[PDB]
Design a protein around this ligand. Sequence first.
Ligand SMILES: *[C@@H]1O[C@H](CO)[C@@H](O[C@@H]2O[C@H](CO)[C@@H](O)[C@H](O)[C@H]2NC(C)=O)[C@H](O)[C@H]1NC(C)=O
Ligand SMILES: *[C@@H]1O[C@H](CO)[C@@H](O[C@@H]2O[C@H](CO)[C@@H](O)[C@H](O)[C@H]2NC(C)=O)[C@H](O)[C@H]1NC(C)=O
Ligand SMILES: *[C@@H]1O[C@H](CO)[C@@H](O[C@@H]2O[C@H](CO)[C@@H](O)[C@H](O)[C@H]2NC(C)=O)[C@H](O)[C@H]1NC(C)=O
Ligand SMILES: *[C@@H]1O[C@H](CO)[C@@H](O[C@@H]2O[C@H](CO)[C@@H](O)[C@H](O)[C@H]2NC(C)=O)[C@H](O)[C@H]1NC(C)=O
Ligand SMILES: *[C@@H]1O[C@H](CO)[C@@H](O[C@@H]2O[C@H](CO)[C@@H](O)[C@H](O)[C@H]2NC(C)=O)[C@H](O)[C@H]1NC(C)=O
Ligand SMILES: *[C@@H]1O[C@H](CO)[C@@H](O[C@@H]2O[C@H](CO)[C@@H](O)[C@H](O)[C@H]2NC(C)=O)[C@H](O)[C@H]1NC(C)=O
Ligand SMILES: *[C@@H]1O[C@H](CO)[C@@H](O[C@@H]2O[C@H](CO)[C@@H](O)[C@H](O)[C@H]2NC(C)=O)[C@H](O)[C@H]1NC(C)=O
Ligand SMILES: *[C@@H]1O[C@H](CO)[C@@H](O[C@@H]2O[C@H](CO)[C@@H](O)[C@H](O)[C@H]2NC(C)=O)[C@H](O)[C@H]1NC(C)=O
Ligand SMILES: *[C@@H]1O[C@H](CO)[C@@H](O[C@@H]2O[C@H](CO)[C@@H](O)[C@H](O)[C@H]2NC(C)=O)[C@H](O)[C@H]1NC(C)=O
Ligand SMILES: *[C@@H]1O[C@H](CO)[C@@H](O)[C@H](O)[C@H]1NC(C)=O
Ligand SMILES: *[C@@H]1O[C@H](CO)[C@@H](O)[C@H](O)[C@H]1NC(C)=O
Ligand SMILES: *[C@@H]1O[C@H](CO)[C@@H](O)[C@H](O)[C@H]1NC(C)=O
Lengths: 425, 204, 163
Amino acid sequence: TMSLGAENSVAYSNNSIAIPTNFTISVTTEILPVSMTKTSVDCTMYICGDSTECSNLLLQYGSFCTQLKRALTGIAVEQDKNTQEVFAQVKQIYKTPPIKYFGGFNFSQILPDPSKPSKRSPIEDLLFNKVTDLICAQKFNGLTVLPPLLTDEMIAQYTSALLAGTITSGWTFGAGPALQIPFPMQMAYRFNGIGVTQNVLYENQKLIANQFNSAIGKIQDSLSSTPSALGKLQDVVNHNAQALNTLVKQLSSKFGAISSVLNDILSRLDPPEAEVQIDRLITGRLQSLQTYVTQQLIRAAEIRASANLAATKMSECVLGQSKRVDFCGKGYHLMSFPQSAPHGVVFLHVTYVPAQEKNFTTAPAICHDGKAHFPREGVFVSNGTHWFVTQRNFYEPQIITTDNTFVSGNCDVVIGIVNNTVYDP
Amino acid sequence: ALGKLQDVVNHNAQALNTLVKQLSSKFGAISSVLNDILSRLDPPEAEVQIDRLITGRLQSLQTYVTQQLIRAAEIRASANLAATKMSECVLGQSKRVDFCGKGYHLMSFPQSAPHGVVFLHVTYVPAQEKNFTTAPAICHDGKAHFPREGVFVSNGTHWFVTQRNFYEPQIITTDNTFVSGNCDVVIGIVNNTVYDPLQPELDS
Amino acid sequence: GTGVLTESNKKFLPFQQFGRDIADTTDAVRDPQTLEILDITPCSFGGVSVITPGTNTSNQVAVLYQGVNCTEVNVFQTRAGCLIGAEYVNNSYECDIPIGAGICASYQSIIAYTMSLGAENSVAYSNNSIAIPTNFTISVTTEILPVSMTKTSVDCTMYICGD
Ligand SMILES: *[C@@H]1O[C@H](CO)[C@@H](O[C@@H]2O[C@H](CO)[C@@H](O)[C@H](O)[C@H]2NC(C)=O)[C@H](O)[C@H]1NC(C)=O
Ligand SMILES: *[C@@H]1O[C@H](CO)[C@@H](O[C@@H]2O[C@H](CO)[C@@H](O)[C@H](O)[C@H]2NC(C)=O)[C@H](O)[C@H]1NC(C)=O
Ligand SMILES: *[C@@H]1O[C@H](CO)[C@@H](O[C@@H]2O[C@H](CO)[C@@H](O)[C@H](O)[C@H]2NC(C)=O)[C@H](O)[C@H]1NC(C)=O
Ligand SMILES: *[C@@H]1O[C@H](CO)[C@@H](O[C@@H]2O[C@H](CO)[C@@H](O)[C@H](O)[C@H]2NC(C)=O)[C@H](O)[C@H]1NC(C)=O
Ligand SMILES: *[C@@H]1O[C@H](CO)[C@@H](O[C@@H]2O[C@H](CO)[C@@H](O)[C@H](O)[C@H]2NC(C)=O)[C@H](O)[C@H]1NC(C)=O
Ligand SMILES: *[C@@H]1O[C@H](CO)[C@@H](O[C@@H]2O[C@H](CO)[C@@H](O)[C@H](O)[C@H]2NC(C)=O)[C@H](O)[C@H]1NC(C)=O
Ligand SMILES: *[C@@H]1O[C@H](CO)[C@@H](O[C@@H]2O[C@H](CO)[C@@H](O)[C@H](O)[C@H]2NC(C)=O)[C@H](O)[C@H]1NC(C)=O
Ligand SMILES: *[C@@H]1O[C@H](CO)[C@@H](O[C@@H]2O[C@H](CO)[C@@H](O)[C@H](O)[C@H]2NC(C)=O)[C@H](O)[C@H]1NC(C)=O
Ligand SMILES: *[C@@H]1O[C@H](CO)[C@@H](O[C@@H]2O[C@H](CO)[C@@H](O)[C@H](O)[C@H]2NC(C)=O)[C@H](O)[C@H]1NC(C)=O
Ligand SMILES: *[C@@H]1O[C@H](CO)[C@@H](O)[C@H](O)[C@H]1NC(C)=O
Ligand SMILES: *[C@@H]1O[C@H](CO)[C@@H](O)[C@H](O)[C@H]1NC(C)=O
Ligand SMILES: *[C@@H]1O[C@H](CO)[C@@H](O)[C@H](O)[C@H]1NC(C)=O
């Protein structure tokens, strides 16, 4: 019987709080499929090939062929639209400065490599390597794979522009003109977004930079060392080729006829029964093609939903800081980096995870001079003998003064109010 | 401009037209008209011809219903998205980037359209940006000062604190800065005075 | 069948006569007069696509043979296929008519080009400089979303059989 999880009992009490005293910069990967293989089918060539009599009999069924071609054309344009929606979200191609110094933060693994001809990042190069006469057989039966409108190098260029915008300008480029800001100041703004003061980032800048660099290196090692990391994108490739193979395989099916070869049927039988045999082959092949188009449409809907989600993540996680829980990684979200992948996008979510929490005795309000004092932005904590006010997400005790507390009412209404002095500047 | 809604209308009529067009298909039978088949053949072979017509027309109708269900799923997803935009953009102000227009979202207006909704997203776009020299903190009297809500900027000789999204320089005082630590830890801290409001009061 | 018979590097065993693909399609054969192996490759086929602007504007057209090399058919070779009737221009513009593999076509005659992704902007990043907005623009933008479709009901018996 499978275990759901490790058992943890939270030490809940009416007057105790746990405050984090440290943090971990966690980078996590999110892999999203964006597009599929664009397929076009020649209905007449697939069902009948070179046989004129088969085409003449096929004409009796009407506009089935036109319907299948139209549906496939809609899917093919939809895939390009999906790629445009996910990646072509900036109209300026931003570039990084020639001096790659960002206050200790290292972005070598995600920025484009000049040495490589493909102009891809090490992570993107790893993603393309790790995602992989079949093509000839699919082509020879009247099924054609159409090239993506955006080539891999242009998609990589779009990711590079997004990375340059998010690194040099923060979230400003997503909401208008790209405004330059130093990267430590940008990270301080992101720290303020999740409710941590700027001083925590500035004082611990080298530690945060080291943690970020270590996490990025771990991400590259994790992708290189795990076969099932890129399972989703490969699955899409796996489905598409298999579908074409199955459709090709359906040409070798008798479908209740004497032979699967039209030429043998013509060369061996009179037209009254040859017409019947060709009709059986036509209905079986047409059913196979309709089945293939129907699954292609269902997969197109699923990929369109995934692409819409990927576009939403690109807008909310890469082009801004998100306050939505778990949308842009596990933890308090700081920023995200896009990486191009075959038929998809990989988001590196940089999040803030609290760590090394410590118990403190807490009170809702402080009673001083017959007045109730409440924290403006923090929480009251006690280490045993002395009372302090600290920010909720990091332990930084400060003296309780009138500057950081506000007075509302007397001490007779608040349940759990404790008596302590409030300093006056 | 209104290509998406018209496209939906274009698909629906076309689907019906295709289904109507499928009535003119022999489907491997002598004729596409059932009345002719009845008026021309005995029931043993008329049953076969009617069977061919029935299976072809039934396949056409099932195909039409299948694409109608797929399109219904797509339109349901679009309608759910439209309801989400109506709740978050019209009935409130959204902090989600690009959900309610390009730029910092202020408000949205709904307009009815045939088979659809048009959202007029009113957003705030920054413009006419100006370069300034910036610092993370101000060092005064051996203490590090950080902005409460803004950013430190310098026009070349003087330091000010301004809000991030609009240029409004103000004198750096204790009211708009907070003190955390000394000047030895912050990388890039610059030396500047921090004004005290109480100093002229007790001085005079 | 029907196909080109090219020279084959495949060494058949003496008992084998035909050859098949992974997907069970014939890819090779042994000639019964001279014991040699031939690579049966089917003749070239392509999806003829016509690239045109509006008839209100012009009647000039270009033809794209999808998947067909240009030697087997203003002739330009693209990864999508062979494009006849459009002149390649080294300038980059926005995409007007999509061709594929980064190639787009436009009317100015019909030209084919590698589409520009966007205007090139280099952000003046430095470790101590910030850009602060001094003004604003109130921008109203349109977002069009479909909500409902036409409600259709079909009488199954009347449609299939009538009276
Ligand atoms: C806060 O105090 C509580 C209680 O003193 C701690 O909870 C105990 O944790 C230990 C080991 O984790 C367990 O063996 C005890 O059974 C727990 N007691 C209760 C009542 O839950 C808690 O670990 C303290 N928090 C920190 C961060 O030290
Ligand atoms: C917070 O945790 C970090 C680690 O994530 C601590 O940094 C380590 O500090 C020890 C002792 O000074 C060093 O030996 C390690 O090399 C440091 N690790 C890294 C990655 O820099 C840090 O000291 C902790 N801070 C507090 C206040 O507990
Ligand atoms: C940023 O990270 C890269 C890679 O993580 C660092 O490049 C390494 O540099 C060391 C010492 O110079 C070499 O021994 C490694 O072989 C390099 N690895 C790679 C993959 O190039 C780089 O030094 C870091 N710092 C900067 C400023 O770029
Ligand atoms: C709670 O924290 C306060 C503040 O750090 C502690 O007060 C200081 O304790 C040190 C060590 O005994 C003394 O050298 C200082 O003179 C104390 N400062 C003041 C203003 O009294 C206090 O001891 C802590 N309490 C507990 C139980 O750890
Ligand atoms: C907090 O302080 C107040 C005032 O200093 C205390 O209220 C006094 O309590 C004593 C005995 O309980 C009475 O004799 C006084 O008349 C009370 N004064 C007022 C103004 O109410 C209160 O008891 C203190 N609470 C704690 C927990 O120490
Ligand atoms: C930076 O801004 C400050 C304040 O806006 C400027 O200081 C004032 O400049 C005007 C014009 O020269 C003088 O009339 C005032 O007397 C100055 N005020 C003070 C308090 O000195 C300053 O000149 C600006 N610096 C630059 C390089 O533009
Ligand atoms: C910022 O101010 C501090 C303190 O006034 C400066 O530190 C002094 O620097 C001088 C010359 O380097 C020394 O002679 C003093 O002993 C230093 N005093 C202290 C307390 O450190 C610092 O140099 C100033 N920084 C800038 C950039 O002007
Ligand atoms: C901020 O200063 C930088 C550099 O001092 C300006 O960037 C220059 O812009 C001009 C015109 O756009 C270019 O010709 C230069 O090549 C740029 N130089 C660099 C180093 O990028 C930038 O325009 C200034 N910002 C504003 C708003 O004027
Ligand atoms: C901010 O931009 C607005 C326009 O978007 C400026 O308003 C213009 O001001 C000029 C000169 O004062 C007038 O001739 C125009 O008629 C104004 N246009 C509008 C639409 O009102 C405004 O002056 C700018 N403000 C700053 C500080 O640069
Ligand atoms: C908290 O609970 C303890 C025991 O459960 C009790 O003695 C104490 O009065 C309670 N305090 C408040 C503020 O409820
Ligand atoms: C910023 O970089 C310049 C050179 O690029 C250097 O002279 C200066 O010391 C740096 N300042 C900080 C705060 O890193
Ligand atoms: C096949 O025919 C050719 C014709 O010249 C002859 O030379 C050869 O011996 C025959 N047999 C085989 C096994 O090739």
